[PDB]
């Protein structure tokens, strides 16, 4: 849960799931950008943000 995370301010469970690569699901309302080009998908802009 993203919102509870924002509340308690832990950031030690998700740090220990982004330092090593574990499949994870950040649930909560969020913005997005709309990428449209293909090269910026061939370039892995997924895990950058």
């Amino acid at each position: 849960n993203l919102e509870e995370l924002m509340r308690s301010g832990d950031y030690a469970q998700i740090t220990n799931m982004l330092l090593n690569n574990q499949p994870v699901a950040l649930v909560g309302a969020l913005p997005f950008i709309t990428d449209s080009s293909v090269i910026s998908l061939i370039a892995k802009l997924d895990a950058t943000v």
Binding site: S8, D10, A12
Partner: protein, 49 residues
């Protein structure tokens, strides 16, 4: 080139030093127990030792 008396004093100053290693697992024990196990306070190490 020291006197044995002066060597006794200086070797006392060299052997017994009151200096000993510091890491992130001693600063973590230096803070009190209630603050270690409080969810209100969020404490970690953002510096290398």
């Amino acid at each position: 080139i020291l006197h044995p008396i002066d060597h006794a004093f200086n070797e006392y100053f060299l052997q017994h030093q009151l200096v000993e290693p510091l890491n992130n697992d001693i600063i973590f024990n230096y803070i009190p127990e209630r603050i270690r196990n409080d969810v209100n306070y969020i404490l970690n190490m953002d510096r290398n030792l």
